[model samples]
Target: MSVIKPDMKIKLRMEGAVNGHPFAIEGVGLGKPFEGKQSMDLKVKEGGPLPFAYDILTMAFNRVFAKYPENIVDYFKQSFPEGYSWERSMIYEDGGICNATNDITLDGDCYICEIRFDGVNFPANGPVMQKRTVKWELSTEKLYVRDGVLKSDGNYALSLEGGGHYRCDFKTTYKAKKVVQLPDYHSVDHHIEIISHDKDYSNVNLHEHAEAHSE
Candidate 1:
């Protein structure tokens, strides 16, 4: 649902996943010999978990409704956006889950330590099909009160379980563009600035009062 920007770059640098899942690379031809190295410090586009770890993690939209029920009601009562209604102004700066029945093929190949020669001399990319699933229990790390109701202080997380899997198949002897090594300084993380207007003041949580009156 997101497109990686053209000029944006996120270079992954890490040693093997120590004490647990090691950095495993599997492919035929010149790449097979490169698999199962514990001492590997790779800068690959694939083969490691760090690059794709964000996919399983997601926004807790329902939990946001649960925790800030009053705030949300007040939110709509105050600023429901003049006639603009597709799904309201969205706020997913973070949280979600996925139990994927369909698999997606991620295609990219970049090598780490042992691209000893030219681009073709390096590792080849295997087909990666993933059946990813995840669930998260919300835990509020921080909260802030704008007027009377609490809102996201931009800090929260979940205790997740039932993670997904990556099935990397056999690779072919595919030639790469370049085996040129770059330094750590070239890597950059993208920053997004979301503007959520919370300037309105709520006289009351009308829904809360109505529910109590109905009871």
Candidate 2:
């Protein structure tokens, strides 16, 4: 049996840099964190009687980015925010494209999760109400929740589509935020009572933020 339960819920917050551009992801019940490959083996031969076996240590992380509309573009910008640049190609056409590889550190409190920037595809118009898929690859040694604190010790490297990659010795302690659900699943927002020492923005008035977002 898997240690992770299906019904168990937790809040998640992500903070890190994508190609030198900093960004953050935060929300309540932000969905489930996933796992990927742990280790791989490679064979090498150099005209030798015996081949050499190499073991590569690796892990994978996956999460869905659904909130914070404006911060997406604000984080990564190579040419222009309007998706237009003086590149001499069709694929290089005008559009908000991030040609950056992300290297980030993720922390989750009251939950077992890791955060990092995967990759992103944006619309030509802007990020507001834009339907796109953002990809991120993260790693963790092992994770579990204890007394509402999310704890983990691992290393991760963010791989952006355009090619900048880096790694970090990752560790974090995530705290749970207060949640408010509107009637009939209309809307929900995560609130916070105390903001931790970390550089995240989960502490805010839910009712006010929800009302403003409802418009």
Candidate 3:
């Protein structure tokens, strides 16, 4: 008997420097540990120190980058989208490779630690995607971290060369506690007027800027 279901409240901290410019991101949210929830796709992993996904975590990485002239926000997007998740290096009791998705390799986004580099576009005067890297994990203390890095690759952030590089990391911690079970969401029956498009006003438009002015 409990007043509320147990859930872990998570807070994430991410920070790194690139081109000598420091950028940091902090966020908080809620998540529940997997309890044999029979519907997980990536749960067939190996073992120990299991990593779970965030269901209610919310954070933004644009504030720090916005300080720069160019909008390199998308750099973080393509490098490590929020939709991506952590995973385990799959193996058997005999040490046989199973899924091996996030096994600290350049294959994909590693859950614990990985060093994969990708080419992300900078929307500049050339082709060929730029270099981007994702780094993560700094031990665990009811918390964890994930990092993403991007480079100009001759497309620098300020002035080509090495000036266009950025590094970002995410750290998170969780604690199990009694979490209130909220009711299922339902849409409310509300009414609002539709917006008037540009063409709509033309039908009733008849305004002369200076013609109607009195001299």
Candidate 4:
């Protein structure tokens, strides 16, 4: 579960064409304490493999946007007093499968909300439903061990087997917003900054994890 907590500032900028006319939305607001739900289900055939090219693009897109709350205006409104709805999709490859359709409803007490994912994925005829209650929690990890130095490292590796070969390797570093514990998941309130993102395609043959060795 994720949310936009009270006093959390927000910024949104979107531009696109609608009915042959150009449209743009730019606004800023503060988030109120609230709870929301997000769920997903994925499956592939016995030999159905993920395509690197498509996965990379899909990941990048999700990083900046989401599938639910299809209408920006409605999202802003419901998020404030309370609301829920769905209808959106992002497909990279022709056969790449990703679908998440759901609705959100809020309770009148101003403290409860419900989200339902009544949707389907690839291999049509199969449906998956997931429900959740949004909540907030504090993170209990120290940001740094010393006053003058801070260190943190993370890596990402992706590979696939299919028509086209794909591979990606990345090392990352982080910058904290404040050294305090807060919700442990993705929240608009957290200010940790991503300093860099890099990928290495040097070895297209490494299928999985192994000892680091020089070529």
Cα lDDT of model 3 by residue, 43-125, tens digit? 11121111111100111111111111122122211222221223222111212211111111112221122211111222233
Candidate structures ordered by TM-score, highest first: 4, 2, 1, 3
In candidate 1, position 152 carries an lDDT of 30
Q: Please state the error at residue 127 of candidate 3 in Å.
A: 9.8
lDDT of 2 at 105: 25
lDDT (10s digit) by residue, model 2, range 91-183:
112232222122222232223333343223323342211212122242323333444443334443434334553333444333323221111
lDDT of 1 by residue, 7-107 (tens): 11111222223123333322111111111111111122333443223212112001101112221222211211120011111111221112111111112
For each candidate, give its TM-score against the true structure.
0.20, 0.22, 0.19, 0.23
Off by over 4 Å in 1: 1-51, 54-57, 60-73, 83-134, 141-151, 158-215
Give candidate 4's whole-model lDDT: 0.23
lDDT of 4 by residue, 1-215 (tens): 24333323333232322112232323232233322211121222121122122232111111111212322211223232333333333332223233323233333322221111111132222110111111112111122223322221222222223223222222111222233221122212111111222232111110111111111
Return the number of clashes found in candidate 4: 2
* Highest TM-score against the true fold, candidate: 4
